[PDB]
Amino acid sequence: DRRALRIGVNGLPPSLEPINGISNTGPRIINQIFDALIRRDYFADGAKGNNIKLVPALAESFERIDDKSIRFKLRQGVKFHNGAEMTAEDVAFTFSSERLWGDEAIKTVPNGRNFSPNWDEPVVEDKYTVVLRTKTPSYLIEKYLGSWLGPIVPKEYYKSLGAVAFGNKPIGTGPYKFRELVANDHVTLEANDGYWGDKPTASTITYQVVAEPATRVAGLISGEYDIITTLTPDDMALVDGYSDLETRGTLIENLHMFTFNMNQPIFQNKTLRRALALAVNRPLIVEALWKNKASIPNGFNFPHYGATYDPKRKPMEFNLKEAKRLVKESGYDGTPITYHTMGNYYANAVPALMMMIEMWKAAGITVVPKIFAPGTTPKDSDILIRNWSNGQWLTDGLTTMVSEFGPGRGVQKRWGWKAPAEFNNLCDQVAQLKDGEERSAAFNRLRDIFEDEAPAVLMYQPYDVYAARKDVQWSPVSFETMEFRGNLNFK
Fold this sequence. Notes:
This protein is an alpha+beta fold. It has 3 domains: 1-34 and 174-251 and 464-491, 3-Layer(aba) Sandwich (D-Maltodextrin-Binding Protein, domain 2); 36-158, Dipeptide-binding Protein, Domain 1 (Dipeptide-binding Protein, domain 1, Alpha-Beta Complex); 254-461, Roll (Dipeptide-binding Protein, domain 3). Helix content is 28%, strand content 22%. It has 16 helices and 20 strands. The chain has a 7-stranded mixed sheet, with helices on both faces. It has a 5-stranded mixed sheet with strand order 15-14-16-13-17. A hairpin with a 2-residue loop joins strand 4 (59-66) and strand 5 (69-74).
């Protein structure tokens, strides 16, 4: 007496552990098995899954003690999938150096330190009260606890298995309890009838991997799947032709871009990087391939940033006259510059590159594509230009301009970006700053330095497309996850 939900997915996460499973394919499963202290209410106040409002979920209420500490009064009676009651010890363990940010913890959870602020050891007050605190001032703690970092894990169960074994048999407080897993095949979650919130609407949720988009579409038409993920606006023509099925698309909080290996002699200066950025006609590419459904942000600036969003920012410059001048100043000899890309990873990555190549040709730059595979990934020295994506996972400007382009991060340390000292000093300031006039003005200067230096060139915010049966009532959210809490009704 409850319909079974079948989901055709592009793949499965490397793990089901909340932090280790963070990927394009991860959150859509992990969000059902786990809950966080704070939940993002995507559909609050009639929004289309884009609202950044943070409502209290595992924590009944929260009071900020100071610039680095928050007291969490927890919900009582919340039970994990194994029956154990969720206490402050479980919440403290979730954000402790033993599990998340310690030197030994990062061996099993590599990105535990990366996806976290400067954590300090949490303090358990009573059975349902814990104080989550950081070593340095941070006004983003609540935003970090409401992101994919948030999910609370059980202390006695996780410790007895480890981050590796827990990823194959996870236990959480979400509305769907993990049942079975077949590597690179499927994940099945049965309905958690002991859920503290609204009773689950589906009996079982299966994540069947259907690697090819055509096979995924055929499966939805045949009746094998209720919802299919990872489709492009071009695939709408076939699915929308069937009256029983429909496409439901959304502008996801991800950023398609192309970065450079600034260790190469040609890309250590900002001159040729700026020439390549100024020659790209972004509206033309979005119009031709995305059917004008993708968005072009005004710099590293997105509406989901909240107070750190400047709606009055100028759009990224398109100047062929200036791009041509920069090529003359750079002393570019005409040697073909490689562009490493996968033929089936980023949506429209190959057709967009073909268009950009003609735009770079107009500026005087010979750019040739180099198709690679996961098992044929090139070494850093073989890379000149490469396509890349950045999931803007925080409901704040910190990710990913500070997150990936800041001091000590990959773009500067691994890809040799000699960033200005002003950029790195402002990156440290915005981390500890409080949302205001000064913090918003610091992000504007960071964006201006980012466009001037051009360590990466932002192409567009992609439009992710899903396809579902009309009898399954589910609206997609603006993130690389699926929300079924009060957003899954069978007819």
